[PDB]
Amino acid sequence: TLDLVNLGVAANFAILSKTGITDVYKSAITGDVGASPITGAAILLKCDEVTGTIFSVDAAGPACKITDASRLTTAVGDMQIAYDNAAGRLNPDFLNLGACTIGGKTLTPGLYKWTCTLNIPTDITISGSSTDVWIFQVAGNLNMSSAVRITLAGGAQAKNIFWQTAGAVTLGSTSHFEGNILSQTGINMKTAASINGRMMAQTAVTLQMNTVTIPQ
């Protein structure tokens, strides 16, 4: 079996970025959100959009913000360790599956690697036990089309799925995603897309009327 990616303090966040969080009102986020080292003014969420705590490095940001530089410093550092751990896994089970377009696949547990932009234009299933692990290594961008749903089968849990992307993620409008996203750049969601997972971006997270839930 594949070892879990350890997220350390970043596990406590539904959204964690380095250059902020933009939003087209209204989104529904369940879990804590933060950004560091950017000012909390870069978190464009309202208090009614977050069930959890909004963390700021400073006195700026949404009215309900909690200022805690040292926790955000640890979280972002733990996110970079996680990113490097996920990107550093060797001996993949698959390389360039579906020639970088994986619509209609059922993905069984293991380490997958793509030396390309990964596209998900139609529904996929992730199928495995409640203890199985998936690590998806994407050297490029990751695109999922409007209305595409990731279905979990067999007991597979969102908390045991990790998507490591060297490029930006784009989740199309009304798409449903499952798993943790460790992005070296942005995570960009569209109109009423949902995610059961964490959005961990070393640039920005951008939302448009999204539902975001930390995995349970």
Residue numbers in the entry: 61 to 276
What is written in the article reporting this PDB entry?
The FfIBP from Flavobacterium frigoris PS1 exhibits high TH activity and relatively strong recrystallization inhibition activity. The FfIBP structure is composed of parallel β-strands in a helical pattern, which is mainly stabilized by inner hydrophobic interactions and intramolecular hydrogen bonds with long α415. Additionally, the FfIBP has a capping head region that consists of two small turns and β-strands, which contain a disulfide bond. This disulfide bond increases the overall rigidity of the protein and reduces residual movement at the ice-binding site, thereby augmenting TH activity and protein stability.
Based on the CD and MD simulation data, four mutants annotated as FfIBP_CC1 (A101C-A120C), FfIBP_CC2 (S96C-L132C), FfIBP_CC3 (M249C-N270C), and FfIBP_CC4 (G160C-S176C), possibly forming disulfide bonds, were generated. Finally, the most flexible region identified by MD simulation was selected as the 4th disulfide mutant (FfIBP_CC4). To confirm the disulfide formation, we solved the crystal structures of the FfIBP_CC1, CC2, CC3, and CC4 at 2.0, 2.1, 2.0, and 2.0 Å, respectively. Among these mutants, only FfIBP_CC1 and FfIBP_CC4 formed disulfide bonds within the intended area. When the RMSD values of alpha carbon mutants were compared with the wildtype, relatively high RMSD values exceeding 0.4 Å were observed around the mutation sites of FfIBP_CC2, FfIBP_CC3, and FfIBP_CC4. Unexpectedly, in the case of FfIBP_CC4, the Tm decreased by − 5 °C, possibly due to conformational distortion caused by disulfide bond formation and a decrease in protein stability. However, we postulate that the forced angle change due to the disulfide bond negatively affects neighboring residues involved in the hydrophobic core, such as Trp174, Leu178, and Val198. It is worth noting that the initial 350 nm/330 nm ratio for FfIBP_CC4 is lower than that of other mutants, including the wild-type.
